[PDB]
Every structure is written in structure tokens, then in C-alpha cells.
Structure 1
Amino acid sequence: AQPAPAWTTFRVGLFCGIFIVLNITLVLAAVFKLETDRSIWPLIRIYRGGFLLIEFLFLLGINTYGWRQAGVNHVLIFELNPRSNLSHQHLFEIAGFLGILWCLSLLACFFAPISVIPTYVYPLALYGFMVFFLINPTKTFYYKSRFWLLKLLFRVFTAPFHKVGFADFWLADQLNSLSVILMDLEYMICFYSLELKWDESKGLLPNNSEESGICHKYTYGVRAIVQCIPAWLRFIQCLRRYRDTKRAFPHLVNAGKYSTTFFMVTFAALYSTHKERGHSDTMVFFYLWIVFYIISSCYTLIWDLKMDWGLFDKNAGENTFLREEIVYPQKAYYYCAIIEDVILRFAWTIQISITSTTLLPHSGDIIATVFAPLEVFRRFVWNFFRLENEHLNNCGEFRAV
């Protein structure tokens, strides 16, 4: 727990201040300097993934600070080398720098500083730089942590063939909460391949109010696939865990919890096709999808409140509807977090598990865009208590002890 250098604290302060001013400038430019004849929704859908990644990195820095101060040893749990472990200052600085780049790209999208370069180049340059920064081979910027994250991502995207650790499970869960990023990446790819209108100088902001492009639609059904990998990876990891340990519990229950998302998205997409093609069983599909909903949310919610966090423990005693041992300084944190998980555990499904693979509401874009940050916030608060439960009493039996 060596203190971070004063230079990196200055750097994170600098990046956070630049981010604040650029954000205020971006908000002011959006409200003042804009023209209401073309749909801004493609831009929002392109940049929502980047914004969610920035927010996730910032909240993960907050999580690392909370873990360090509370007492939960995330270094041992994650199986990291104690010498080069990232303090919360480094995560804050990375989040701030990538937020600087995101704000600059969005500003360039709002008004084109250079008339020669087309406005659709900016979203692509931002994510290209993000990928190159993540895949940078030269040992210059956070090389140890970056390479460790690359190994972890490789292991999590090839889940069945690798023995699971806590890092793999944890990153798979984070991906499960970050499905919006994958869906936005798929939307970016489809939009640039079909509907971008490369020739047009303002192609990414088309005039047609009617969204006839199939990119926001789901005719091919690949959108369900790209939305469903984040749960499929966890399902396969749970199956591999059971195959390795030959324990029906708690791995098949978890696999069922993660496979509820399969039926969720399935029936959502079938409802989308059935209603947009004008069939007589659209109401039946909607009712069956609602039926698989509620079970999906309650399954995930009870899992979060009982096994992920360890709360509602019988032997709590003085603590009410909590665990016997608590490491966070204030007991009200758990009580507020339970209500937060309850409220955001029904919202997250409604907003991005659905409503983005089916076009039931017109305001679905607004709901998804406004609730995905609360999805990442729910994941951020879930991280605190899952890691705290891991430190106190081993869950999932990742550790030998």
C-alpha cells in the first residue's frame, strides 16, 4: 500500500479538471450550437459505449480505493503481484485521460474544426486509439497492467478451455454489466458498413426522421448474439467450474441464473420480429417474455443479495437482514445498497437487456441511454460487497483456504 507519487496525483487532478471543463463545454455546445433537422441518435449510440467505459474505469478506481481503505485485500483475491499492483490513482488517471479523448472526439463531432476531415472520422479515431492503447506492445504506458488485462480478456473470451480464477469470473461479471458497450460496438460496425453514407459530409447524422435503417432494427438477429455473449461467457464458465469440481451446487444454480438471460433476449427478439411482422401471437410472445422476465430479475437479485454479497445471513444476530461480519465503517451502506440493488435490478433488464433488441417503446433509446450509467453504478456497488464477501468468508471456493 505504498503511496502514489505526487506527480501522478497532479496528473489525475489535471485530467479530471480538463474533463470537467470539456464536459461543461460539451453540454453548452449541445444545448446552444446545434440544428434540429437530423437525428442525433446515431452519435449518442456510438459514444455511449465510450462514456460507459470511462464511467466504469472511474468507478473501478473508486472501488479500488474503497477496497484498500476498508481492509478487503483485492490483491490477494485477484492473485496479483503486490509490487506492481495499480493504486486507485492510476485507474483514476487512465479514466481521466480516456475521458479527455472522448470529450475531444465528441466536441469535434459537434463542430468540425477541420472541414477537410469528415465528421464520422472522429468516432472511429477515438475507439481506434482506445484499442491501440490497450494493445500497445511497447512497454510505455501501464505495460504490466495492460498485458495482464490482455491475458485476462483472452482467458475470458475463451472461457471453457481455461481453468477459472477469481479474475476471470470477476471480469466476466463486469462484461455482463457492460453489455451496452458490446452492443454499441456492434451498432458502430453495422452503421459504418451499411448506413454511414461515406460520401455524405454529415452521413452519421441523417436527415430522415424515420429510422428505416436495419441497424437499429433486428432483422438479422445478430444483435441478440452480441447482447448475449456477456451472459453466455458466465454460463460457460459456471459449467466449466462444475465440470472441474463435480459439485452441482453452487454452479448449476449459477448457470441457470446466467442462462435466464438467454431466454430473456430470445423471447424479446421473437416479440420484436412477431410484432414488426404483424402476427397473431404477438401478445402471447409478449406475455411469455414478461413471464421469463421477473424470474430472471429475481434470480439475479436473490443471487446478489444472498451469495454474491453474503447478506440475509441467518447468524447475523445484531445486524438485521445482513451478515455477521462487516468490514465497511458504516452499517447504513449495506442497507442502502440492498435497496439500490433492488431498484436497479429491475431497471437494468428493462432498459438494456431488452428495449435494445426489440423496439417496443419510441423512448427506448432515451431509457437505455439514461439507465446504462445506473447499470454500471449497480455493478460498481456490487463490486464492493462481492469483494468484501470474498475477503471475509470464501465464496465460490476460488481460494484453497
Structure 2
Amino acid sequence: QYEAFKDMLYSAQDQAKRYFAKFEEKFFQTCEKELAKINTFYSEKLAEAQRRFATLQNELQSSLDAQKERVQHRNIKDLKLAFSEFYLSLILLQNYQNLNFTGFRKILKKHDKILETSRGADWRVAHVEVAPFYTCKKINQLISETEAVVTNELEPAWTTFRVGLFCGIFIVLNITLVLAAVFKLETDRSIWPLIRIYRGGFLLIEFLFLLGINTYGWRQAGVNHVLIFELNPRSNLSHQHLFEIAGFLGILWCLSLLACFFAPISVIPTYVYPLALYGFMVFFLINPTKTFYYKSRFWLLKLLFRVFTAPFHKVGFADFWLADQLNSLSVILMDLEYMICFYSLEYYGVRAIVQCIPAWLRFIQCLRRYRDTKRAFPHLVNAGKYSTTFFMVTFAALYSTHKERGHSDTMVFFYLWIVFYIISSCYTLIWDLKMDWGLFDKNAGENTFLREEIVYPQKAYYYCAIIEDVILRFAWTIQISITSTTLLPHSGDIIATVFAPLEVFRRFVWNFFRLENEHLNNCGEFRA
């Protein structure tokens, strides 16, 4: 009785220590009574489902044994419907469990807000979270069993229109960019090596686009990203939303660049359009209003705030995901730093530290994880894996310094860098192929060099992904070292650019496989 709970809370508030205290026992007693009712009704129906499952399975087994004609054919059709309706019941009970749990959580939160007390959350954790109706996973077990048995034995418009709009405008504007740059760029001076470094928000845009594709892939394959990301099922962000938002940012970026090449109103200088774009982006993200996906924007901002101060807060799954995401999205941070730099002016070493900061964040997050769980494995291995990049980049910078300046110790540091370009790459590759993806499983015979259970349709996906990741991991390390400007005056600003999109591509594939593994296996002990 959620609504009547709310009515009681409002009546107590309006009818207002002894008064509040006496009211406190009453609602808890009401909460206890409702909890028992839900617990009882849950247990009875759950028991009924188990009996029905047994009866259906025996009937299915008996029908199959005779099969191993018309009377049999009708029975199979009858059985399929019986499991179909039965499957619906399990979902209903499965939904039943969530709604009551949500109501308890939400209503007890309101009592806390109204009475400005923490007793509600305490009662929730003491009673509701431990209640059999919530702690009983047999509903999921039954659902999975029914799905497997059936599969084996028996067998918004406006948003989409907006997505189409933005995608079409983006493609046409992109063709416009290509034509203009090829033809209407009558500037032989140092113009490429500036816009070429404004390849910032572009990487962000394509990253969002690939993220939308990731969402679609997880949805279609079956991996439920909503549970692992601790997102509520009632406000899920379909891949269409990511697509439209990516298209919108793309339109903004492309209008900015196109204006930059051409000559809009002369009163406006050419060096403000990138500033306008990047200011509009940040304002849109930090829009304090309640429009334009305020829920999702607030959630993302809270995630970022937690992530950038990882050592203090507990590490959730989203924390780890965003940290690894930013790990490959370092070039964006480097570009932002360079932005600030030459605008303030137009290795003092800030380059390297800003480049490696994502690695620092992930490493310290892993340290916090280890401190909280207090188990060396696998956390210490991650600490080493993410500190190797620190060591590699610092050695790269020092080698650059000595080689340019002239010190004969340059060779030693060259050797150091080349070894840390392998002893680092190898750890990354082996980890992504063994734990984050879980492949090379001993207990996998039919799937060859895969895991025992597979979700995605064709194994060719896994086989090609392995080799592409192998070839591109070394590219990540070499590119991140190069961006530390070893010397590479002019051939480096181009290779880093042409590889950053490849980095995001690798992150796209890695997202697929990491979430697949987590959905099937635990690897990272983040649940339970």
C-alpha cells in the first residue's frame, strides 16, 4: 500500500518528539505487516511455479520419449503454449519482486526525508533487503531453466526521426567538409597543424556513436547492461538516444569547423569558433535545468565526480567502466590541455602528467578496490598493469629530453623504453585476452579457444576480434609514447591523430567483450 503509506506520512507531517516518536513505531509496524504479506504471497506463488515447472517438464519429457503422430503433434503445440503462459507467470512474479522492493526502498526514503532521519534506510537494510522475497533468486533460476528448455527441446517514433535527421545532416556536412578542405583551402601556412590538433570533440562524438552501437549490441545479444550498470529498468537509455545525442554533438562540431575554414561575419574572429563549440558542449553537459536528459546528465556528472576522486568513495562497476573508458580517451585530455596552453600563450612537463592521469586514476581506483576487498589477486596485477604505462611514459619523456639535449645516457633510456614498450604491451594484451574477456578457457572444447558459454551468434566475431586487438594494442602503446613527443617533429602529430579513432574502435570491441564476460561470468567480483 504505497499510496496509503505516503498518505500516512503526509498526515503525520501536517498533524505535527513524542508525537513523531509514537508515529515512528506505527508505520514500521505497518511496514512489517506489508512486508510479511508480500513475503508470504511471494513464497506461495514461487512454490506453485516450482510445482508447475516440474509437472510441465515431466509432461514434456513423457511426450519427447514417445517421439524418440497427430496426437503427438497436438501435444507439442499444447506444451509450447503451456511453457509460453508459464513463462509469462514467472515474469509477472519476477516483476512482482521488483516493484515491491522498489516501493519499500522509495517509501522508506521518503520517511527519512520527511522526518529527516536515517532510521528508514536502517529498517530497509535490516528487514527488506534480507527478506526471502528479495533474497530468493529461484525466480531467475526458473526463468533461465524454462528459457533453456524451450529453446533446446521445443524450438519512440519522434526519437527515431530525430536520429535520422541528425545522421543525415551529419553525413552531408561531412561531405561538405571533405570537398571544402580538398578544394577551398587556399592556405599553405601552418593551418593543418592546429585544426589537426583540434581533433578533440570529434573523437568524443565517434566514441558516443560507437557507444550507441554497443548499447544496441548488448540489448540484442541478451546481456542485460541495465542490471550490471545498476540502472533502473524504467528509465533505460535505448541506443537511439545515444545515436541522436552523438548526431547532435557532431552537427555542433562540424558547423564550428566549417565556419572555421570559411569566412563567417568578419567581426567574429576565426579563433573563437572552437571555443564556442567547447563551451557549448560543457554548458550542455552541465546544464543545471531539468530538460535535455537531465536525469542522465546528472547521473553522468555524478559518475565523473566519483571517478575523479576515486580513493575516497567505494568502487562500483560504473566507476571501473568509466575509468577504463577514459584510459583510452587520453588524447582528448591532451588536446584540452594544449587548448589551454596556447590560448594562455596565444615538455613544461604538464604534457606527460596530463597524458598519464587516466592511468593514475585507474591505478588508485584499483588500490582502493584492493583495500576494501583485501585480496592481492587480481588487484595487484592490475596495479602493475596500470603502473607500467606510468613507467613507460616517464622513460619515454626522459629519453626524449636526453636525445634532444645530447646526454650520452640516451641509449640506456632507449633500451628502457623499448623494453617497457613490450613488458607493458604484453601484460595489457594477456590481461584483456584472459580476464577482461575470459578467453583461453581450459573448459572449452567445442568452442576451441573460447569460453564454455557464448552469447554472440558467430564465433568469427571472437576470432577476428582477437587478432585485431593484438595488432592494435601495440599501436596504443606506441602512439601514447609518441604523443610524449620523443622527437618526431612532424610525422608524429599525424600518426597520433590517425590512430586515436582506432583506439576508440578497440575500446568499442573491448566494451562488447567485457560486458559479455561480466554478464555470464563474474571475473570482477562486483556482485554479491
With the length of structure 2 as denominator, give the TM-score of the two structures.
Answer: 0.69
Unaligned runs of 5+ in 1: 196-219
Q: For 1:36 and 1:257, locate their aligned partners in 2 and report how far apart those are by CA, in whole Å.
A: 45
Instruction: Give the CA deviation at 1:42.
Output: 4.2
Q: For 1:261 and 1:236, locate their aligned partners in 2 and report how far apart those are by CA, in whole Å.
A: 14
Q: For 2:397 and 2:368, locate their aligned partners in 1 and report how far apart those are by CA, in whole Å.
A: 28
8 A Cα contact 2:212 2:240, kept in partner:
yes
Instruction: Give the CA deviation at 1:395.
Output: 1.7
What root-mean-square deviation, in Å, do the aligned CA atoms of Structure 1 and Structure 2 show?
1.1
8 A Cα contact 1:337 1:381, kept in partner:
yes
CA 287–361 in structure 1, closer or farther in 2 if over 3 Å, else same:
farther
Q: 335, 340, 350: which one pairs with 2:463?
A: 335
Q: Which portions of structure 1, spanning 4 or more consecutive aligned residues, are displaced by more than 6 angstroms? A: none
Q: For 1:358 and 1:16, locate their aligned partners in 2 and report how far apart those are by CA, in whole Å.
A: 39
8 A Cα contact 2:366 2:379, kept in partner:
yes
- Aligned length, in residue pairs: 372
Q: For 1:159 and 1:357, locate their aligned partners in 2 and report how far apart those are by CA, in whole Å.
A: 29
Q: For 2:161 and 2:198, locate their aligned partners in 1 and report how far apart those are by CA, in whole Å.
A: 28
8 A Cα contact 1:355 1:361, kept in partner:
no
8 A Cα contact 2:397 2:484, kept in partner:
no
8 A Cα contact 1:177 1:376, kept in partner:
yes
Instruction: Give the CA deviation at 1:283.
Output: 2.0
1:351-399, CA deviations, whole angstroms, 9 ceiling, x for partnerless residues?
1343344333631111101000000000000000000000000121011
8 A Cα contact 2:482 2:492, kept in partner:
no
CA 45–177 in structure 1, closer or farther in 2 if over 3 Å, else same:
same
1:274-315, CA deviations, whole angstroms, 9 ceiling, x for partnerless residues?
122122122221111111111111111101000001111110
8 A Cα contact 1:356 1:364, kept in partner:
no
Q: For 1:354 and 1:85, locate their aligned partners in 2 and report how far apart those are by CA, in whole Å.
A: 40
**Stretch of structure 1 that moved more, 51-60 or 351-360:** 351-360
8 A Cα contact 1:309 1:389, kept in partner:
yes
8 A Cα contact 1:272 1:360, kept in partner:
no
Q: For 2:413 and 2:483, locate their aligned partners in 1 and report how far apart those are by CA, in whole Å.
A: 15
CA 167–353 in structure 1, closer or farther in 2 if over 3 Å, else same:
farther
Q: For 1:191 and 1:355, locate their aligned partners in 2 and report how far apart those are by CA, in whole Å.
A: 17
User: Is 2:420 the partner of 1:271?
Assistant: no
1:159-193, CA deviations, whole angstroms, 9 ceiling, x for partnerless residues?
10010011000000000010010000001110111
Instruction: Give the CA deviation at 1:47.
Output: 2.5
Q: Percent identity?
A: 100
1:319-375, CA deviations, whole angstroms, 9 ceiling, x for partnerless residues?
121111110011110111000110110011111343344333631111101000000
Instruction: Give the CA deviation at 1:46.
Output: 4.1
User: Is 2:478 the partner of 1:344?
Assistant: no
Tell me, what secondary structure is at the counterpart of 2:196?
Answer: helix
8 A Cα contact 2:393 2:484, kept in partner:
no
Q: For 2:172 and 2:414, locate their aligned partners in 1 and report how far apart those are by CA, in whole Å.
A: 45
Residue aligning to 1:63: 214
Residue aligning to 1:109: 260
Q: For 2:225 and 2:304, locate their aligned partners in 1 and report how far apart those are by CA, in whole Å.
A: 18
Tell me, what secondary structure is at the counterpart of 2:377?
Answer: helix
Instruction: Give the CA deviation at 1:112.
Output: 2.0
Instruction: Give the CA deviation at 1:194.
Output: 0.7
Tell me, what secondary structure is at the counterpart of 1:118?
Answer: coil
8 A Cα contact 1:84 1:144, kept in partner:
no
Tell me, what secondary structure is at the counterpart of 1:46?
Answer: coil
Q: For 1:67 and 1:56, locate their aligned partners in 2 and report how far apart those are by CA, in whole Å.
A: 16
Q: For 2:485 and 2:313, locate their aligned partners in 1 and report how far apart those are by CA, in whole Å.
A: 31
Q: For 1:391 and 1:167, locate their aligned partners in 2 and report how far apart those are by CA, in whole Å.
A: 14
Instruction: Name the structure with the higher helix share.
Output: 2
1:27-64, CA deviations, whole angstroms, 9 ceiling, x for partnerless residues?
11111011243112443344311110001000000000
8 A Cα contact 1:227 1:353, kept in partner:
no
Q: For 2:497 and 2:482, locate their aligned partners in 1 and report how far apart those are by CA, in whole Å.
A: 13
CA 236–351 in structure 1, closer or farther in 2 if over 3 Å, else same:
same
Q: For 2:425 and 2:400, locate their aligned partners in 1 and report how far apart those are by CA, in whole Å.
A: 20
Instruction: Give the CA deviation at 1:138.
Output: 0.4
Q: For 1:282 and 1:355, locate their aligned partners in 2 and report how far apart those are by CA, in whole Å.
A: 19
Tell me, what secondary structure is at the counterpart of 1:294?
Answer: coil
With the length of structure 1 as denominator, give the TM-score of the two structures.
Answer: 0.91
Q: Which has the higher contact order (CA 8 A, sep 6+)?
A: 1
Q: For 1:160 and 1:296, locate their aligned partners in 2 and report how far apart those are by CA, in whole Å.
A: 24
Q: For 1:124 and 1:366, locate their aligned partners in 2 and report how far apart those are by CA, in whole Å.
A: 23
8 A Cα contact 1:238 1:251, kept in partner:
yes
